[PDB]
Motif scaffolding. Structure first.
Motif, PDB file in Angstrom:
ATOM      1  N   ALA D  37     -32.938  -1.142  11.101  1.00 45.49           N
ATOM      2  CA  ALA D  37     -31.566  -1.125  11.312  1.00 45.49           C
ATOM      3  C   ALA D  37     -31.090  -2.566  10.528  1.00 45.49           C
ATOM      4  CB  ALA D  37     -30.794  -0.867  12.527  1.00 45.49           C
ATOM      5  N   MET D  38     -31.756  -3.660  11.320  1.00 40.66           N
ATOM      6  CA  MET D  38     -31.227  -5.083  10.791  1.00 40.66           C
ATOM      7  C   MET D  38     -31.540  -5.337   9.394  1.00 40.66           C
ATOM      8  SD  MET D  38     -32.786  -7.263  13.774  1.00 40.66           S
ATOM      9  CE  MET D  38     -32.910  -6.383  15.335  1.00 40.66           C
ATOM     10  N   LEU D  39     -32.711  -4.800   8.928  1.00 43.77           N
ATOM     11  CA  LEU D  39     -32.916  -4.701   7.474  1.00 43.77           C
ATOM     12  C   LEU D  39     -31.950  -3.811   6.756  1.00 43.77           C
ATOM     13  CD1 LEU D  39     -36.886  -4.567   6.867  1.00 43.77           C
ATOM     14  CD2 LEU D  39     -35.160  -5.585   5.331  1.00 43.77           C
ATOM     15  N   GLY D  40     -31.473  -2.658   7.040  1.00 44.98           N
ATOM     16  CA  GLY D  40     -30.828  -1.910   6.502  1.00 44.98           C
ATOM     17  C   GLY D  40     -29.332  -2.427   6.499  1.00 44.98           C
ATOM     18  N   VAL D  41     -28.740  -3.121   7.702  1.00 41.16           N
ATOM     19  CA  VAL D  41     -27.429  -3.597   7.626  1.00 41.16           C
ATOM     20  C   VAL D  41     -27.306  -4.662   6.777  1.00 41.16           C
ATOM     21  CG1 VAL D  41     -25.567  -4.439   9.041  1.00 41.16           C
ATOM     22  CG2 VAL D  41     -26.960  -2.579   9.931  1.00 41.16           C
ATOM     23  N   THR D  42     -28.365  -5.422   6.631  1.00 37.11           N
ATOM     24  CA  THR D  42     -28.441  -6.690   5.973  1.00 37.11           C
ATOM     25  C   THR D  42     -28.478  -6.288   4.363  1.00 37.11           C
ATOM     26  OG1 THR D  42     -29.196  -8.386   7.644  1.00 37.11           O
ATOM     27  CG2 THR D  42     -29.889  -8.797   5.166  1.00 37.11           C
ATOM     28  N   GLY D  43     -29.138  -5.385   4.003  1.00 35.32           N
ATOM     29  CA  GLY D  43     -29.203  -4.830   2.640  1.00 35.32           C
ATOM     30  C   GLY D  43     -27.846  -4.079   2.386  1.00 35.32           C
ATOM     31  N   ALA D  44     -27.074  -3.438   2.952  1.00 35.30           N
ATOM     32  CA  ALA D  44     -25.954  -3.040   2.782  1.00 35.30           C
ATOM     33  C   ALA D  44     -24.767  -4.169   2.825  1.00 35.30           C
ATOM     34  CB  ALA D  44     -25.502  -1.686   3.777  1.00 35.30           C
ATOM     35  N   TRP D  45     -25.158  -5.252   3.425  1.00 34.31           N
ATOM     36  CA  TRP D  45     -24.316  -6.355   3.430  1.00 34.31           C
ATOM     37  C   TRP D  45     -24.512  -7.117   2.041  1.00 34.31           C
ATOM     38  CZ3 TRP D  45     -23.703  -9.648   8.574  1.00 34.31           C
ATOM     39  CH2 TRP D  45     -22.523 -10.455   8.392  1.00 34.31           C
ATOM     40  N   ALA D  46     -25.688  -7.451   1.792  1.00 32.30           N
ATOM     41  CA  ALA D  46     -25.979  -8.289   0.670  1.00 32.30           C
ATOM     42  C   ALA D  46     -25.927  -7.672  -1.038  1.00 32.30           C
ATOM     43  CB  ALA D  46     -27.308  -9.063   0.779  1.00 32.30           C
ATOM     44  N   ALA D  47     -26.147  -6.403  -0.747  1.00 40.12           N
ATOM     45  CA  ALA D  47     -26.318  -5.801  -2.094  1.00 40.12           C
ATOM     46  C   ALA D  47     -24.749  -5.584  -2.726  1.00 40.12           C
ATOM     47  CB  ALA D  47     -26.820  -4.337  -2.233  1.00 40.12           C
ATOM     48  N   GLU D  48     -23.794  -5.085  -1.897  1.00 41.32           N
ATOM     49  CA  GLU D  48     -22.461  -4.956  -2.628  1.00 41.32           C
ATOM     50  C   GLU D  48     -21.692  -6.396  -2.455  1.00 41.32           C
ATOM     51  OE1 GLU D  48     -20.177  -1.837  -0.369  1.00 41.32           O
ATOM     52  OE2 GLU D  48     -20.595  -3.205   1.465  1.00 41.32           O
ATOM     53  N   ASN D  49     -22.217  -7.265  -1.944  1.00 40.14           N
ATOM     54  CA  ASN D  49     -21.789  -8.628  -2.350  1.00 40.14           C
ATOM     55  C   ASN D  49     -22.426  -9.095  -3.610  1.00 40.14           C
ATOM     56  OD1 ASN D  49     -19.997  -8.786  -0.236  1.00 40.14           O
ATOM     57  ND2 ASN D  49     -21.257 -10.809   0.894  1.00 40.14           N
ATOM     58  N   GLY D  50     -23.551  -8.969  -3.855  1.00 36.58           N
ATOM     59  CA  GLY D  50     -24.022  -9.193  -4.914  1.00 36.58           C
ATOM     60  C   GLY D  50     -23.517  -8.564  -6.504  1.00 36.58           C
ATOM     61  N   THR D  51     -23.268  -7.380  -6.165  1.00 38.22           N
ATOM     62  CA  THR D  51     -22.834  -6.434  -7.159  1.00 38.22           C
ATOM     63  C   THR D  51     -21.568  -5.365  -7.018  1.00 38.22           C
ATOM     64  OG1 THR D  51     -23.771  -4.669  -9.113  1.00 38.22           O
ATOM     65  CG2 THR D  51     -24.743  -4.857  -6.927  1.00 38.22           C
ATOM     66  N   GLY D  52     -21.363  -5.091  -6.027  1.00 37.33           N
ATOM     67  CA  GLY D  52     -20.154  -4.343  -5.528  1.00 37.33           C
ATOM     68  C   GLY D  52     -20.202  -2.760  -5.302  1.00 37.33           C
ATOM     69  N   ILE D  53     -21.694  -2.104  -5.270  1.00 34.56           N
ATOM     70  CA  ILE D  53     -21.940  -0.888  -5.086  1.00 34.56           C
ATOM     71  C   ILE D  53     -22.158  -0.642  -3.621  1.00 34.56           C
ATOM     72  CG2 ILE D  53     -23.134   1.081  -6.350  1.00 34.56           C
ATOM     73  CD1 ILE D  53     -24.500  -1.123  -7.931  1.00 34.56           C
ATOM     74  N   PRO D  54     -21.333   0.271  -3.217  1.00 36.04           N
ATOM     75  CA  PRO D  54     -21.711   0.752  -1.518  1.00 36.04           C
ATOM     76  C   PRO D  54     -23.060   1.449  -1.671  1.00 36.04           C
ATOM     77  CG  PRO D  54     -20.035   2.151  -2.889  1.00 36.04           C
ATOM     78  CD  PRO D  54     -20.135   0.863  -3.665  1.00 36.04           C
ATOM     79  N   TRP D  55     -23.639   0.945  -0.393  1.00 45.68           N
ATOM     80  CA  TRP D  55     -25.263   1.370  -0.132  1.00 45.68           C
ATOM     81  C   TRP D  55     -25.068   2.757  -0.295  1.00 45.68           C
ATOM     82  CZ3 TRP D  55     -25.626   4.765   3.866  1.00 45.68           C
ATOM     83  CH2 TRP D  55     -24.893   4.868   4.818  1.00 45.68           C
ATOM     84  N   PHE D  56     -24.507   3.680   0.036  1.00 41.14           N
ATOM     85  CA  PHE D  56     -24.386   5.158   0.267  1.00 41.14           C
ATOM     86  C   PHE D  56     -24.170   5.633  -1.216  1.00 41.14           C
ATOM     87  CE2 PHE D  56     -19.738   5.772  -0.284  1.00 41.14           C
ATOM     88  CZ  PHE D  56     -19.440   4.476   0.756  1.00 41.14           C
ATOM     89  N   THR D  57     -23.612   4.852  -2.278  1.00 42.20           N
ATOM     90  CA  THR D  57     -23.891   5.250  -3.642  1.00 42.20           C
ATOM     91  C   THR D  57     -24.805   4.664  -4.334  1.00 42.20           C
ATOM     92  OG1 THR D  57     -21.523   5.319  -3.549  1.00 42.20           O
ATOM     93  CG2 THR D  57     -22.277   5.733  -5.491  1.00 42.20           C
ATOM     94  N   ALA D  58     -25.483   3.639  -3.944  1.00 47.69           N
ATOM     95  CA  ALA D  58     -26.685   2.857  -4.600  1.00 47.69           C
ATOM     96  C   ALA D  58     -27.946   3.772  -4.695  1.00 47.69           C
ATOM     97  CB  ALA D  58     -27.111   1.624  -3.850  1.00 47.69           C
ATOM     98  N   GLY D  59     -28.000   4.739  -4.097  1.00 49.60           N
ATOM     99  CA  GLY D  59     -29.037   5.630  -4.525  1.00 49.60           C
ATOM    100  C   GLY D  59     -29.318   6.455  -5.755  1.00 49.60           C
ATOM    101  N   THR D  60     -28.169   6.967  -6.139  1.00 49.10           N
ATOM    102  CA  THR D  60     -28.205   7.596  -7.362  1.00 49.10           C
ATOM    103  C   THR D  60     -28.168   6.890  -8.449  1.00 49.10           C
ATOM    104  OG1 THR D  60     -27.027   9.620  -8.295  1.00 49.10           O
ATOM    105  CG2 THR D  60     -25.586   7.417  -8.087  1.00 49.10           C
ATOM    106  N   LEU D  61     -28.311   5.506  -8.709  1.00 45.47           N
ATOM    107  CA  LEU D  61     -28.391   4.800  -9.520  1.00 45.47           C
ATOM    108  C   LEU D  61     -29.751   4.791 -10.292  1.00 45.47           C
ATOM    109  CD1 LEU D  61     -26.791   1.575  -8.383  1.00 45.47           C
ATOM    110  CD2 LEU D  61     -25.694   3.194  -9.884  1.00 45.47           C
TER     111      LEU D  61
END
Ligand code: CHL
Ligand code: CHL
Ligand code: CHL
Ligand code: CHL
Ligand code: CHL
Ligand code: CHL
Ligand code: CLA
Ligand code: CLA
Ligand SMILES: CC1=C[C@H](O)CC(C)(C)[C@H]1/C=C/C(C)=C/C=C/C(C)=C/C=C/C=C(C)/C=C/C=C(\C)CCC1=C(C)C[C@H](O)CC1(C)C
Ligand SMILES: CC1=C[C@H](O)CC(C)(C)[C@H]1/C=C/C(C)=C/C=C/C(C)=C/C=C/C=C(C)/C=C/C=C(\C)CCC1=C(C)C[C@H](O)CC1(C)C
Lengths: 201, 158, 225, 202
Positions: D37-61
């Motif tokens: 979870a630490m890894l997951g919350v950090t990923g959901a934190w950093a990814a959409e700061n970097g590029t703006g895509i919510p983590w629950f939509t980042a799968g389909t890319l």
């Protein structure tokens, strides 16, 4: 027999379905029952006296324009606070509630020392002494009064769960659903609304 | 069961007094006992200070609002100078009372209603009354000046 | 008047129940050490009085930092210019400075906080308390000790001191004190360098973190070069 | 306890008022779930700061057909993830490498497959203390206290991930987007105003 409905009270017996490992649960369910009792009754009375659902009653009092709740109470010709004064204020109500309910909860649960001087052990959900102005427990049977209250506790919690899931299914409200079910029993039930799709399907 | 309220003074029915809800009520007794005159353990000077301040403060008001110059713009200054003059007269009255009153021994002591023997009030002596008079003078003049200040300062004064 | 001398038997409106220590057994893993628990890392311990001096500056600087914070959040006026509002002249403005204030210090019209009025009350209240705290004046509360920064009688109505661990709470206050004093020093230096309030400097630093720093303003000379 | 002041307690520290601690495997499960979870919350934190895509939509890319979109998503990257000319991080490519690497790590974490290292590393221990902690921060630090820190971060981050999934289900807006809306105006942007709007369904 006493409590012959289904299972047995925490004071005596074992749960048919749960192990009852923790003894904190007993008093927890007493408090939960009592709160539910007041909640279900509130949902019963509000939608009678005002016609609004209990779940959308919160929207009437908001940090802007909390005056909607003023005078909503049956009878009570004077509003909560005078009209045009705009004094029904969500923050004022919230702060009063925070201080009053927080103090009451701290007194009940030992976060703060009890203001009174007469017994009142922390963690007992049947204090009695200060909480019986009418003296009904000593006059009546203590044990069977406690069992009646428990039956009400569990009944009202189940009624509350029913109220919230009715709110989620039909999106209308508890008493309006009750009246619809009474008017056309076959044509107003959960399976009927399932045939309509519960409002989403 | 058939409670009687009015009782003799300290239970003695042969003294010229009766204890009533005006005399021995707890609220009345606490108010009077807390007034500066009845603080016998406090220095007479400071009791005279408060006394003078209270008295000189109010006594100015009648001269302000009903004196000869009440209509003029100098109504307040006239009333306060009248109050100061009255404070000086009362200081003279206090000085002569202090010189004359305490000339006797008063061999009999004093006790509280509970029966505790207590020392005499230092105010009730010649030098103590002199100190009280000096406190009266200072307090009265300060109170008169304060009344002047407040009439010139206070927002809703008229 | 007779002597009643009955039993009051009153309890605190709030009296915190025992909650003990909410900190690890180690109490100052941070740079330096609390007084009376080790050697001062850098500056020499000037005097036994210096510990209490640190506590007082700390509590005062806490209150000052929170005041500048809340004043700038509620009015937008920087703390270092809030003094110019209430002056012997036109102290009426200082009144309506509190967000949500049901009423003004200055009712509409003449009705107003005068500088001299405020000042005279300020001297008569704060100086009295300051003296009563220290050896000046006398002790109106004999049960407490003048010259002790932690009296803990009437001055803890909620009883957090006795409810928890006293010394961990003390060091917690000390750490908060030192943090707030250093933050206050930062606030005065920021006021000197940028001429803008603390929350204004914060907002500038968080809106674009990479710029709006010490060194960014130094590139412009702190508006002096 | 003195150290653990949170509402509940750590396994071995005592017993929880609700759902008390049973099997030790539950404690192992809690720690590992926290770690992911630490890894997951950090990923959901950093990814959409970097590029703006919510983590629950980042799968389909990334999809079996096209997975070019995931390439060049990381901010600051000097070059494309695979050739700019023809990005080759295909979903199958990702899968075939990741299933083998993650399956290996998992089986080697739990010891169902014979360990490669055999460096004394004992499976079914949440704290291996071997190559996993090269800095050996535990050796210098106080291991009990550090275990408590690890569990506090575990529970906090698992709760944060629960918050992320339920915010996705209610507002479908994104974690940092929900943060920014709340900081913008918490009074008029919170769970209860979204309830007044109806969570997008009612
Ligand atoms: C714990 C007590 C309590 C509970 C259970 C509720 C529950 C509710 N309130 Mg109320 N409120 C409560 C206390 C209070 N509310 C309000 C003021 C409001 C406002 C202003 C609003 C609500 C709304 C709501 C509903 C949706 C919010 C939610 O969390 O559901 C999430 C759903 C779940 C199933 C939870 C899991 C829901 C029926 C909102 C509403 O009416 O939306 C329709 C709304 O806008 N409440 C105040 C301040 C006086 C309270 C004080 O204790
Ligand atoms: C003499 C005055 C007066 C009268 C005749 C009624 C009459 C009624 N009230 Mg009202 N109420 C009155 C004053 C007040 N009521 C309320 C708050 C309520 C509540 C909370 C409830 C009633 C309910 C009821 C009904 C029983 C009935 C219609 C109850 C009802 O069934 O509502 C339909 C109900 O639950 N009244 C308050 C507090 C502000 C009052 C203060 O004056
Ligand atoms: C006891 C097992 C049993 C189960 C699991 C179901 C399940 C279902 N029935 Mg059936 N039924 C069952 C027995 C019977 N049904 C019927 C007669 C009907 C009718 C007449 C209707 C259903 C409908 C439904 C659906 C909606 C119920 C609901 O809201 O649940 C939701 C619950 C959950 C999501 C979680 C718990 C659901 C798929 C209704 C429908 O419209 O289906 C589309 C409907 O109208 N059932 C009879 C009488 C002979 C039964 C006798 O035992
Ligand atoms: C009773 C209604 C009323 C309401 C809703 C508010 C609301 C507010 N005031 Mg105000 N105030 C109110 C009355 C009063 N305030 C003040 C004096 C202050 C101060 C000194 C402060 C506030 C602050 C605040 C904020 C704190 C939010 C929380 O925490 C909020 C905007 C705080 C603030 O500005 O935070 C930035 C703050 O520091 N208010 C006084 C005089 C004693 C009031 C008297 O009626
Ligand atoms: C720990 C592993 C893991 C988890 C938890 C998720 C979680 C998710 N993925 Mg991801 N993924 C994971 C691994 C991987 N994903 C992908 C590639 C994708 C794709 C292509 C898609 C997802 C989608 C989703 C969502 C599915 C939601 C759902 O089914 O309804 C809710 C389910 C629950 C609430 C469970 C109860 C959710 C955000 C889908 C999505 O949302 O697209 C927008 C989608 O299309 N993921 C790959 C391979 C490269 C993974 C490798 O391990
Ligand atoms: C010159 C090289 C270089 C630079 C300056 C940056 C700079 C940055 N990267 Mg990028 N990156 C770079 C190369 C690379 N990045 C990544 C993968 C990532 C990730 C995974 C993350 C960043 C993040 C960040 C940001 C860190 C902000 C904080 O901290 C910042 C924009 C972080 C971010 O999004 O923070 C906002 C982040 O989580 N970068 C890879 C591997 C594909 C790179 C390869 O060289
Ligand atoms: C998968 C994660 C996970 C696991 C395996 C555990 C396991 C454990 N925890 Mg930990 N814990 C977690 C998450 C977890 N917890 C989180 C998120 C919190 C913060 C709220 C805590 C807070 C916490 C405290 C405060 C304490 C424990 C304790 C315990 C032990 C008690 C036995 C128990 O409850 O196990 C069973 C495991 C469970 C997770 C319980 C089930 C909870 C139900 C199913 C509700 C969850 C709803 C779910 C999220 C719905 C999602 C729907 C969504 C997908 C749509 C055990 C070691 C106690 C302990 O060790 O005491 C000595 C203790 O005091 N935990
Ligand atoms: C005026 C406030 C103040 C006071 C009275 C003290 C006093 C004390 N501190 Mg505290 N401390 C303070 C500020 C202060 N400190 C701040 C802000 C910090 C955070 C940086 C600390 C951090 C700290 C730690 C970590 C430790 C102490 C310790 C001590 C003690 C030993 C030092 C000593 O006696 O000499 C005090 C001498 C001075 C304060 C002189 C230093 C003067 C420099 C130049 C600073 C001037 C500030 C500023 C630039 C002035 C601007 C002027 C303006 C016109 C522009 C003593 C109780 C130690 C201790 O308790 O030992 C056991 C310890 O371990 N303190
Ligand atoms: C009045 C009012 C007006 C406003 O408009 C809005 C508002 C929200 C403010 C509102 C206020 C309401 C309030 C204050 C409510 C308080 C409610 C509370 C405390 C509810 C508790 C609800 C509890 C539930 C569901 C239990 C489920 C548990 C179940 C089945 C398990 C049963 C179980 C067990 C244990 C043992 C057996 O052997 C076997 C089985 C399996 C049967
Ligand atoms: C980063 C990333 C970026 C992409 O864009 C998308 C992406 C999806 C791939 C994504 C990937 C993320 C990943 C891999 C995440 C892994 C998450 C994990 C392991 C979550 C675990 C979540 C665990 C929960 C909720 C626990 C709930 C349990 C609760 C409350 C009970 C609490 C409880 C207990 C036990 C006992 C006490 O006495 C008291 C109480 C009763 C409170």
């Amino acid at each position: 027999d006493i409590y012959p409905e289904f299972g047995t009270y925490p004071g005596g017996g074992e749960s048919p379905i749960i192990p009852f490992g923790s003894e904190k649960n007993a008093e927890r369910e007493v408090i939960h029952g009592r709160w539910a009792m007041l909640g279900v009754t509130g949902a019963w009375a509000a939608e009678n006296g005002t016609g609004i659902p209990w779940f959308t009653a919160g929207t009437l009092c908001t940090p802007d324009d909390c005056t909607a709740v003023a005078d909503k109470f049956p009878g009570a010709v004077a509003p909560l606070a005078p009209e045009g004064s705009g004094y029904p204020s969500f923050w004022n109500v919230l702060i009063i509630e925070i201080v009053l309910v927080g103090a009451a909860e701290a007194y009940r649960t030992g976060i703060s020392d009890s203001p009174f001087d007469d017994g009142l052990t922390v963690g007992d959900v049947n204090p009695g002494g200060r909480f019986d102005p009418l003296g009904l427990a000593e006059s009546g049977d203590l044990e069977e009064l406690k069992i009646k209250e428990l039956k009400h506790c569990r009944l009202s919690m189940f009624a509350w769960l029913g109220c919230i899931f009715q709110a989620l299914a039909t999106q209308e409200g508890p008493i309006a659903n009750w009246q619809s079910h009474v008017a056309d029993p076959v044509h107003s039930n959960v399976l009927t609304n399932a045939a309509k799709g519960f409002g989403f399907y | 069961d058939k409670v009687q309220i009015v009782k003799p003074i300290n239970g003695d029915p042969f003294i010229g007094m009766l204890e009533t809800p005006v005399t021995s009520s707890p609220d009345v007794a606490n108010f009077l006992s807390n007034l500066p005159a009845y603080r016998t353990g406090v220095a007479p000077l400071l009791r005279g200070v408060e006394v003078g301040l209270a008295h000189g403060f109010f006594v100015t008001g009648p001269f302000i609002k009903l004196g000869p110059l009440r209509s003029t713009d100098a109504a307040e200054l006239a009333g306060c100078l009248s109050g100061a003059g009255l404070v000086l007269i009362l200081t003279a009255c206090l000085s002569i009372y202090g010189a004359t009153a305490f000339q006797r021994e008063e061999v009999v002591g004093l006790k509280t209603l509970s029966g505790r023997t207590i020392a005499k009030d230092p105010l009730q002596s010649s030098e103590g009354w002199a100190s009280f008079t000096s406190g009266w003078l200072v307090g009265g003049l300060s109170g008169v000046a304060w009344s002047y200040v407040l009439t010139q300062v206070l927002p809703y004064y008229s | 008047r007779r002597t009643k001398a009955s039993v009051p038997a009153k309890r605190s409106a709030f009296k915190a129940n025992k909650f003990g220590s909410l900190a690890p057994p180690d109490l100052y893993p941070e740079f330096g050490t609390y007084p009376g628990g080790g050697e001062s890392p850098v500056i020499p311990f000037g005097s036994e009085k210096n510990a209490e001096r640190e506590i007082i500056h700390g509590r005062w600087a806490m209150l000052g930092v929170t005041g500048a914070w809340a004043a700038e959040n509620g009015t937008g006026i920087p703390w270092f210019t809030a003094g110019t509002l209430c002056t012997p002249d036109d102290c009426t403005a200082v009144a309506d400075k509190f967000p949500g204030a049901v009423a003004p210090l200055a009712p509409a019209g003449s009705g107003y906080p005068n500088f001299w009025a405020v000042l005279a009350i300020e001297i008569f209240l704060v100086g009295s308390a300051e003296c009563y705290r220290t050896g000046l004046f006398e002790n109106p509360f004999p049960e407490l000790t003048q010259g002790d920064v932690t009296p803990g009688g009437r001055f803890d109505p909620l009883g957090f001191a006795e409810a928890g661990d006293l010394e961990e709470l003390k060091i917690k206050e000390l750490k908060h004190s030192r943090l707030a004093m250093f933050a206050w020093l930062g606030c005065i230096m920021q006021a000197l360098a940028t001429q803008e309030g603390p929350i204004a400097n914060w907002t500038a630093h968080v809106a674009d973190p990479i710029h709006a720093n010490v060194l960014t303003n130094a590139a412009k000379g702190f508006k002096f070069y």
